[PDB]
Design a protein around this ligand. Sequence first.
Ligand SMILES: [Zn+2]
Ligand SMILES: [Zn+2]
Lengths: 69, 114, 135, 94, 91
Amino acid sequence: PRKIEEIKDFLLTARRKDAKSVKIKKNKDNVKFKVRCSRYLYTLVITDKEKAEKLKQSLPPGLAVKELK
Amino acid sequence: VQRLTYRRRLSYNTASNKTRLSRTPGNRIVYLYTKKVGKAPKSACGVCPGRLRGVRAVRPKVLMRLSKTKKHVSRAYGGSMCAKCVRDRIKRAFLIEEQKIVVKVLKAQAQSQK
Amino acid sequence: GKFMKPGKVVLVLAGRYSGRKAVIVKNIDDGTSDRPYSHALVAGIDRYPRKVTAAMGKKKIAKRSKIKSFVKVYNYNHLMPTRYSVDIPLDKTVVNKDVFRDPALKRKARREAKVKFEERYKTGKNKWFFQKLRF
Amino acid sequence: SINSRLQLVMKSGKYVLGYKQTLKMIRQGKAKLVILANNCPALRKSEIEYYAMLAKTGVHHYSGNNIELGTACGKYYRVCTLAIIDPGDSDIIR
Amino acid sequence: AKRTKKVGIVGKYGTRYGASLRKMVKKIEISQHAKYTCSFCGKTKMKRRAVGIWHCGSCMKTVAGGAWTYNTTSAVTVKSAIRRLKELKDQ
RNA sequence: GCGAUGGCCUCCGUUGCCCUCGGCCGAUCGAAAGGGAGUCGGGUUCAGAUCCCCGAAUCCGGAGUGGCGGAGAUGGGCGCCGCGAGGCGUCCAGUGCGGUAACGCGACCGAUCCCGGAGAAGCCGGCGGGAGCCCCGGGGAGAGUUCUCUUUUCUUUGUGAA
RNA sequence: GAGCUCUCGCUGGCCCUUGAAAAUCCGGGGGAGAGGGUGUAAAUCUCGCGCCGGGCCGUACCCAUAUCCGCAGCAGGUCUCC
RNA sequence: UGGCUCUAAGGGCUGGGUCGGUCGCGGCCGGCGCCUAGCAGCCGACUUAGAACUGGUGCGGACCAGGGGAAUCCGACUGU
Ligand SMILES: [Zn+2]
Ligand SMILES: [Zn+2]
């Protein structure tokens, strides 16, 4: 898998046509967004909680953003 | 102490049957079969014992997967000959050409005198 | 006496331009407190013109007679001097040591060296300098 | 003999021992004489001869090898090429 | 003579193989394992790689010489004779 | 180079002929321990699971129309308009770039031909690095003894390939 | 921790012993040839992605004081790893 | 040659740039001490030698674990 340092790069990766279910895992200050693609599972780690909450609303097409629990 | 077995049918410990220990998330030591240690290409000069630098030491069939920049260095005879022997060849070629020019001039002078 | 002059020709013995022929445009041989070793700024040719053979024409002759130059500072131990000298103008205002800090200035220096080398390659002068070293 | 002149140069004159330093001295133009051992590599010998031709410097091919040249120069190590810059009171330079 | 009186290198063979045979071997055993002076670099790096072939550690020069010695007296004699004949022929 | 069909006979593919180029070195067989690109972790059956399920990868081949971005890439000069950013016309160069150097940057045209490397290497001794296991001083969790003592003794205390 | 095993790397000693071939892959010398002509193109030993496929055969168990060979559930023999 | 109680020897890591000035205990500069006979603190694997005491002279306490010397004949030996 590949880690992403930029939220804009994560959004560009998630906006792909081949992109699919993007899960959200709240890991007690280590919250992550994992987007599945054809070849790699791209991960984005957000330290802030409000930033992750705001990014939760950035999914364009109504994907499978269902969280992990 | 956890004793472990081979995961393949080649029970004999050969060159192709080399293994290493690895710990899994299941908390049990298992065998992982390691690839052979590749060697970097040697200089085409044939005199320097050392191997070429700036190139990955990997198997030849993995050289196919490797990119172009990893397989050579940006220089004349790059990735095939060492820089020391390259510059020695350059200066030797220049000096031999100069000597040939001098010999030709001397031969022409001798012909003119005779 | 000293034979490292701004008219001399050298052979580059190291770096990406190994084996290339260059003409010295500046010599230091004392130091700079930033480049302490004795050195010389030179302008060389990365790509030599191809053979013409006179069975070519006009457009193909022009295409073949192309020169790709470079400008570089080399240590004296990485240069091979020769008897031959090239009397190329190479106006010092464009080719200087400040071009190595700004990419645009180095681009202009390379363009100027290319123009001068291309205009001197014709007329059949210093044809030894425009022949690649066979090694 | 050349050995006595070399000994006098080492005692009084200025000398450079080695290849890299000798080449740098020749390029700077300070070296007035060059001495090459007979067992010198041919490529290095031709390089030194060409440099001395460019710098208008005399070259002498010493009869002995590098070990004998070092012994004559008074050094317990071996020297293959030697540069003489300014002899003190010897006639090593014609 | 610190440890052994008159065996030295052939002390590894012990009491075996006969005193005269060990004494005869000693010369060859010392000569083949002794490092000679390479007359290309001046270093004591000439080491017998195999039978009749010697290698310089520094020069990386390989020389075809004698089986146990770098230069044999027969080789020296034939080289001198060949040089003399060459000089006589060419004049 | 010639001839023909096929498909928006534009453009390409195909076969037929001619010219051209061309060393190999013997057809073939010969190793489930030699060489040989690339899969690991968890779960699962009464009995198979590096094979089945889940999750992460990777190798080779294809990719015509090329599906996308990115490298060859958007430079200089001259003459005009416009306060300015900028726009037009014309000459051009442009198969990359940096570091003295070892070399580096995601690419960075290329044939017949030639050179080289990997594949591809004996036995033994010494030393050093890393890992698996063992040891000790402790924290926890579960626990045998406790007629006397024992901050107790016993088990566990982790992370794959890429 | 000269602790046991595996692996990697240096360093040595021995040979009148010098300790394998081929498939396959890659690098380098050259410019035969291609490109569009001032905004585009030929090329990408393909830089990051995206699409399709990988066919055939073995896969259980014993591997040994009872699953092999010795007339047998034979004190015999049978090549390895932890 | 046991047991127990001691002694001696064989080592690693860190620490003084202390005074003044200045900036935010930390950093920079100046002349200082320059431990140049080294000291102070903290850690760790085993050994070697010696001393006393003591057991019903028993102590490589089970296990592992060479019988030697003087000669003769043959074959050098290793090996088969
Ligand atoms: Zn070399
Ligand atoms: Zn040598």
